[PDB]
Amino acid sequence: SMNPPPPETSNPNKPKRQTNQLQYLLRVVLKTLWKHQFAWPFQQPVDAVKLNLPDYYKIIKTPMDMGTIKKRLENNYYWNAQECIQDFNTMFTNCYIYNKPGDDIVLMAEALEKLFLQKINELPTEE
Ligand SMILES: CCn1cnc2c1c(=O)[nH]c(=O)n2Cc1ccc(CNS(=O)(=O)c2ccc3c(c2)CCCC(=O)N3)cc1
Known part of the structure; x- marks a missing residue:
């Protein structure tokens, strides 16, 4: 019946970071999956x-x-x-x-997962 609250996306007590790997995850991985017709x-x-x-x-x-x-x-x-x-x-x-x-x-999930694995194969080394 009711939905639960969605997962948190920010928390003031959890430390935050940007890394080049996380930037790749956003700019390349997430965006590549998101454009897919099955996303x-x-x-x-x-x-x-x-x-x-x-x-x-x-x-x-x-x-x-x-x-x-x-x-x-x-x-x-x-x-x-x-x-x-x-x-x-x-x-x-x-x-x-x-x-x-x-x-x-x-x-649909399997197609996205296959693609995800392609993209994470190319995750850069940390800077
Ligand atoms: C991922 C969360 N979620 C969101 N909607 C969800 C879920 C979930 O877990 N389970 C669900 O049944 N739901 C509803 C639901 C949402 C969407 C769909 C799929 N509708 S489609 O895109 O027109 C479609 C139609 C034919 C078709 C595909 C996809 C697969 C590839 C090609 C293929 O051979 N056959 C089927 C069920």
């Missing part, structure tokens, strides 16, 4: 109410979406690339867990 279901938190996705937040207790990731990067929320990569992987995994294998939304 739109992943661009905002799941509205379980409007999507009619039964039990979404009964099953998924660590929701994540690319809009949240984008805003985290914009706000210097991540300390390191591993934290950001983990959020992408949580987003994909949530899709694989909630939906049935082979579902069209799963095909």
